[PDB]
Design a protein around this ligand. Sequence first.
Ligand SMILES: Nc1ccnc2cc[nH]c12
Length: 502
Amino acid sequence: SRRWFHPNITGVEAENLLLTRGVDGSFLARPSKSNPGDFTLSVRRNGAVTHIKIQNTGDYYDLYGGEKFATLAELVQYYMEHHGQLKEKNGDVIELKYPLNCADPTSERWFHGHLSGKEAEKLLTEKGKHGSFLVRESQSHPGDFVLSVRTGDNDGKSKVTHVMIRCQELKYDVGGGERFDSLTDLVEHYKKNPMVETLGTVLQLKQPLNTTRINAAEIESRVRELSKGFWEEFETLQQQECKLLYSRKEGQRQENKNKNRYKNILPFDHTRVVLHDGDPNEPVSDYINANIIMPEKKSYIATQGCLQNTVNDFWRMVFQENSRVIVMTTKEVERGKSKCVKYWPDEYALKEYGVMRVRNVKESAAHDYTLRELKLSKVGQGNTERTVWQYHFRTWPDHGVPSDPGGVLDFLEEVHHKQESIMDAGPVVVHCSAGIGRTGTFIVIDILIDIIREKGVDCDIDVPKTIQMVRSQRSGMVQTEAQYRFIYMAVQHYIETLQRRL
Ligand SMILES: Nc1ccnc2cc[nH]c12
């Protein structure tokens, strides 16, 4: 349901699992082992198992012989409600009917594995609030587990209770009543239906303990401890994408289909940019594949590379939102395929895009990017002209991430100073191809640097929490583990620079 992903499984295992525990229509997804950021959708069809490759090189999930997706959970939702859109080479349908659930708790935010009793009491004391909990392996009774929960209002008014969870022939229970198939089933039961202590305290399971937050100045040590890891921390974050299937109905409307670069990577309704003051003629003129991203001053608009038939809408958007800065993170063409049509005029040229006029005043080549100084106005209305600075990052490698972040960091410092130099500039527009991989990586790095720029080096940052907040505003922002490590590398490199100064 949100447990059809099996992190530490092999092909062999996945096949036996589907052959013993499933039926035709059963399915699961898993990572490939040494293959960086490949995945496999395993499916049982007519008493045999089919494996289907999914690749992510950083822009989107490409399912072989299906479509491209912003998240695996979006992929499963699409096919679990579109009977016959997934097919084999030969055009037989592959039905995804019944998720095959995984019991491994290593991806759950509350699971602290191989942790002691005393260390758990301390973390709940220093980091924990009322209702804060974790599940850890028992040391008294091996095989078993312990649920540890803070309850109350450092002076007596709170306490930590420890509940033993027995493991017995494959099932989990708290000493009586219901026996659960997974620790996740157990936790989800007792979070709905809390245990009540003999004398009446309720063991409310409200939120897991946070272990991702760090002091920015402790970055070097954390990156070193994640390098051994990163994979587990990313996997835990990925698991939480099940929570973000918000509606994308405007993007799914007939009138809007040919405005999406990829027909299933759509903006959420709740944060989509809405275009006003359009043609009365057009059937639907309010739509563009873009979302507002507000951190939780500077906001961003995340959007896809222009299509031929959306260039005019793109400039309607920039004008409406009073954006003065555009960040482009793809070449127009990579691996011989269009990623973004040229929506700006040649140097010294002037062009009309619907009701908008844009002049390219001047281009400046820098090592990692080109800057284009553009002038945007509404045709027939002088004194609406404003300067839009387009920063075009040119050297991002075709697959994977730059091996060093300094180029990226130098680029965002410059984007930041330009933005901050213009009074009431609107949101910075950021776009790549689909507008979720690079685009989210640049935005998330920008959000974190900004904190450090204001609060300096002795401030709290939380990379996965920041990514989760951004993913709640556009599907699948930050696509791959490589991008996740890069974000960390970027912030580390920013912090080192700050301290060599001082
Ligand atoms: N646990 C997980 C749930 C949903 N999607 C993904 C992608 C990698 N891990 C995942």
